[PDB]
Amino acid sequence: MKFGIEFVPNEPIQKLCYYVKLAEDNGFEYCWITDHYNNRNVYMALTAIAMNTNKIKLGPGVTNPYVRSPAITASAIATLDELSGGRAVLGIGPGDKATFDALGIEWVKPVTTLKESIEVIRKLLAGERVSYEGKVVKIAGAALAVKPIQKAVPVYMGAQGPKMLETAGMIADGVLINASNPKDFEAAIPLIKKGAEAAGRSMDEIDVAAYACMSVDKNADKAKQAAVPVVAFIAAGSPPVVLERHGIDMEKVEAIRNALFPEAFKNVDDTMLEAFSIYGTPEDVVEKCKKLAEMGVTQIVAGSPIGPNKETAIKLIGKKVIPALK
Amino acid sequence: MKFGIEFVPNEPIQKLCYYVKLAEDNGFEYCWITDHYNNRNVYMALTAIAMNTNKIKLGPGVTNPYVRSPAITASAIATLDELSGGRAVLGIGPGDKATFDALGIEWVKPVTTLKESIEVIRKLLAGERVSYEGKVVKIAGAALAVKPIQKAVPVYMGAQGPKMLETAGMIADGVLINASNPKDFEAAIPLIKKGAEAAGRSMDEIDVAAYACMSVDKNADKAKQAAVPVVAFIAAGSPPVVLERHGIDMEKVEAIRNALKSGNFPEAFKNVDDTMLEAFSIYGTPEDVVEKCKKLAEMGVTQIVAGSPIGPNKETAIKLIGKKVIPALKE
Ligand SMILES: C[C@H](OP(=O)(O)OC[C@@H](O)[C@@H](O)[C@@H](O)Cn1c2nc(=O)[nH]c(=O)c-2cc2ccc(O)cc21)C(=O)N[C@@H](CCC(=O)N[C@@H](CCC(=O)O)C(=O)O)C(=O)O
Ligand SMILES: C[C@H](OP(=O)(O)OC[C@@H](O)[C@@H](O)[C@@H](O)Cn1c2nc(=O)[nH]c(=O)c-2cc2ccc(O)cc21)C(=O)N[C@@H](CCC(=O)N[C@@H](CCC(=O)O)C(=O)O)C(=O)O
């Protein structure tokens, strides 16, 4: 099993550089930084991370076709790959309606715009002159001067909806799914497989990644309790099909959505902690990851909280979780 | 053949970080930075270099037991290995009398000092609490809190003389020999092998490195011209044994010795001839240099250090070596 780590660049980048180097020392293989206009800029954070790291893969987790021209994205990814000596990965997704409303941006065909941005980004990274008259994305004679070091920078798609999961199976080198429980993947992987069989691809070409809420501590209950605030936020934002897949009292969920705080947090129960987070001792967490692996998951991203204390939990994971899971 | 690159940190450290990143891009595997009190500090240079690189191995080429405590050398190396994610190498040598006469440092038994220093550095790096009552190095209760990432950081000895070569066979993970010609390695690798056999070691455990003067250019004569000033210095400093081995006109040498002594660089270079260029440098076209490196591999060289001048232009030369030399010699 491969492990990733994710951070919002909402603290001074030096602190983030410490966490990621700590993650590299502890055998994490992927570093994913969120991209939102209100936080520190993702590529500037990835530059500093690159300079403080040596082996860990890194890149946006995830950017999108809208807040920058896909041409700019491609050139940013190439710069990162150059600087890091061939370690870049491109996490890319459609974004969200709240953002583009705020920014005055049209949320044009999410699935198509993404598919086509990705095809255009792959070609520019290959050093091709690109003339591409898509439905949404339209390029005329663009070329990069900057080159990546890798022949093909991996592209990981964020996908929650059915079409995106299938579109990912057809084009993506990997898929980031905001899920933490094996049932979420029993459903979504066939949807990716459908796309992958369609396009002639084996599932060996596709890193299915669990972008999970993790919370590991030496004390099971200290760990469980660190999970609670993120779990309460998940339950709120989940669509009913997920609510029905794991069997969640929409009663609590109206009480959590409403309370949102300590009232929101009080209504979080054990079926929700089962459903939206890998929590427990290292031995509990090692077991939950084993199960996700049987379901086709090849990367687990230890998202927030990483534990009650991120620093302590990164180290605990390095000592007692990563080596037990190959 | 693995390739290394050498650099004196005598320009702003950002310029050096560019050259090393460029060498990494171009497939060089080792970066060796000299350690002399008059230039930029070797470990501050290596720190910056580590932050601008990702996979090239890096270290001092070479430090010595005298200008810092060996315990300070150990923790500096551990700090480098931590920062770089496990890429450090410790190049270490006895230093030189001229420096320690300048600095008021007694050049005590260079071979026993070096062996004892290397042994203490390794025990320190292995995390041991160290009490060591050597003939020169005496340590009581010392222990590092800083830990390397590599279980064993490699130790490369710089070695020109036969007792230093023998010692390297017994204790070193690699040997940096300042020489560019197969005749030097014919003479030296038997000496290394004797120490290895005495210590019970295979020669697969030992990276024999030619710390060479290299000058490559699409134009062989331009390459040759660029190597002269460095060759002038190597001929001048060569011990007497080395110059007869290669048949250097010893009168052309003294003329080079006086000119550099006075700082008369143009007079020094006027006295360098083809015999010293073939003796003390690897020069010419990429095809020429590839052939010369194969003749070095034949004597038992497993790393070539593309030392100064690298080429007429360092930046151009690093790229040409990357494109036309390293791939040809890559097992
Ligand atoms: C757009 C939406 O896609 P979704 O897969 O359900 O959810 C998208 C999320 O993944 C998206 O919000 C991500 O960008 C969020 N995301 C982040 N978004 C950000 O931009 N920044 C972040 O840092 C970020 C982090 C993050 C981390 C992990 C991750 O797991 C995702 C991340 C959707 O509606 N998908 C539908 C497509 C429906 C649709 O849009 N149809 C249109 C277009 C179809 C076409 O024309 O091709 C139509 O009917 O015409 C589906 O899958 O069926
Ligand atoms: C001490 C001297 O050793 P040497 O092997 O000739 O030293 C030449 C170089 O290796 C040495 O000067 C290096 O430190 C110089 N050097 C630099 N030295 C620096 O300190 N900084 C540098 O950056 C540097 C760069 C460098 C790069 C490559 C390189 O290959 C050498 C480098 C010597 O005379 N050795 C003889 C005699 C050994 C000896 O001293 N025996 C004594 C001592 C006995 C005892 O100590 O126990 C005796 O028998 O009485 C021998 O090897 O046989």
Numbering used by the authors:
A (entry chain B): 1 to 260, 265 to 330
B (entry chain A): 1 to 331
Question: What does the article say, verbatim?
Answer:
Here, Mer from Methanocaldococcus jannaschii (jMer) was heterologously produced and the crystal structures of the enzyme with and without F420 were determined. Crystal structures for the apoenzyme of jMer and the binary jMer‐F420 complex were determined at a resolution of 1.8 and 1.9 Å, respectively. The active site of jMer is located in a cleft between the α/β‐barrel domain and a helix‐bundle subdomain composed of five helices. In the experimentally determined jMer‐F420 structure, F420 is associated with the α/β‐barrel domain with the isoalloxazine ring positioned at the bottom of the cleft in contact with the C‐terminal loops of most strands of the (αβ)8 barrel. The residual part of F420 pointing to the entrance of the cleft is sandwiched between the loops after β4 and β5 and reached the N‐terminal ends of the following helices. The cleft is sufficiently large to also accommodate methylene‐H4MPT with the pterin head adjacent to the isoalloxazine ring of F420. Gln178 is located close to the bottom of the cleft at the C‐terminal end of β6, which is presumably hydrogen‐bonded with the F420 isoalloxazine and the pterin ring. Glu6 at the C‐terminal end of β1 points towards the deaza‐isoalloxazine and pterin rings. The NPCP bond in jMer is located in the loop after β3, below the central pyridine ring of F420, between Gly61 and Val62.
Methylene‐tetrahydropterin reductases catalyze the reduction of a methylene to a methyl group bound to a reduced pterin as C1 carrier in various one‐carbon (C1) metabolisms. F420‐dependent methylene‐tetrahydromethanopterin (methylene‐H4MPT) reductase (Mer) and the flavin‐independent methylene‐tetrahydrofolate (methylene‐H4F) reductase (Mfr) use a ternary complex mechanism for the direct transfer of a hydride from F420H2 and NAD(P)H to the respective methylene group, whereas FAD‐dependent methylene‐H4F reductase (MTHFR) uses FAD as prosthetic group and a ping–pong mechanism to catalyze the reduction of methylene‐H4F. Mutational analysis of four functional amino acids, which are similarly positioned in the three reductase structures, indicated despite the insignificant sequence identity, a common catalytic mechanism with a 5‐iminium cation of methylene‐tetrahydropterin as intermediate protonated by a shared glutamate. Based on mutational and kinetic analysis, evidence has been provided that all three methylene‐tetrahydropterin reductases have the same fold, similar methylene‐tetrahydropterin binding positions, and the same basic catalytic mechanism; however, the binding modes of the C1 carriers and reductants significantly deviate.
